[PDB]
């Protein structure tokens, strides 16, 4: 179902994918719209959604869906974007 | 009016820290938070098993908005404001 | 009009650095801040025992708003502006 | 209408990375960017020799505004939005 | 003279200078207004503008000149502020 907050991420380089676009409880229709695939990384008990696109492409698709970036941060070697439906 | 929440990577999974000892008990109860004292700390912390995206959606319904998100060590922190 | 405050992890516990040597003495007194000097520093700093969420709430009452929050090393820093 | 640009420290000197392989060729041309494939990468990147402050000013003239700036590794990244 | 964006920085501690306030192409009048001087770090072939003031002092001076902080970030042991003339 619809969720107003989204978290997306990519590891450096920022210009290339994959971009993580969702967790197990993400909107399946939105994940399908992004062209995302579902997988379970080694050691995780949860599925994650990801796309081969770089984050700029994902951000533009999310903008057309009504999402806006509220914040971006780095942690480890990962860039994370926090978006909100507004 | 201000809230600080956090999770360690992975961002898609909990636990999420949702409060310090002086947090509003009613808001903590609304989030379904548990209270615990980590080893070595003399203060209680409120936490939930939910990932941060779930907590952010619950706080949005309570009038909070994310002002900023940052990384420190291996932790992601969100600063929210009631407005 | 600008303020910089900080705390080291854990974010839920103090001390919180609330000023440099040239900070507004009246605002530092209002926050209940004390002066201290780190061993290798030739300057005084203002600090409170409160965690940063408590300081942020006191600063909102004085007309300050968080514009940005970031991590550096093991420190969380907030940049506030009086609006 | 989002953009991501970056530079490694020092922030006062280029090169500034201004685009990925699928970036708007007109905007890349407006920035005076060159296209190259770094050693070991299968993708092309757009870059300029200018420091990021110069790039930010050029993007401002095309209606872009910085929403966020962050550090990761030894890289500074800016996220801009056409607004 | 028109500087839509500014980048300033200091290394920790944030309560003490020097604060880097410009690159070689910065407006000399704004640099003079801040009381900035030029310096060259050993490894750089370019000069930078700096002040002995901590960043809070610089932010207040820039606020009086029409600048507003849009973002602040840490990278390595440096704090950087991105300001926009608005
Ligand atoms: K990437
Ligand atoms: K987590
Ligand atoms: K602390
Ligand atoms: K650079
Ligand atoms: K400093």
Numbering used by the authors:
A (entry chain E), E (entry chain C): -1 to 84
B (entry chain A), C (entry chain B), D (entry chain D): 2 to 84
Give verbatim lines from the article.
Guanosine triphosphate (GTP) cyclohydrolase I (GCH1) (EC:3.5.4.16) catalyzes the conversion of GTP to dihydroneopterin triphosphate (H2NTP). This reaction is the first and rate-limiting step involved in the de novo synthesis of tetrahydrobiopterin (BH4). The effects of GFRP on GCH1 occur via formation of heteromeric protein complexes between GCH1 and GFRP, which are dependent on the intracellular concentrations of the effector molecules phenylalanine or BH4. GCH1−GFRP complexes consist of one GCH1 decamer flanked by two pentameric GFRP complexes.
GFRP occurs as a pentamer of 50 kDa (5 × 10 kDa).
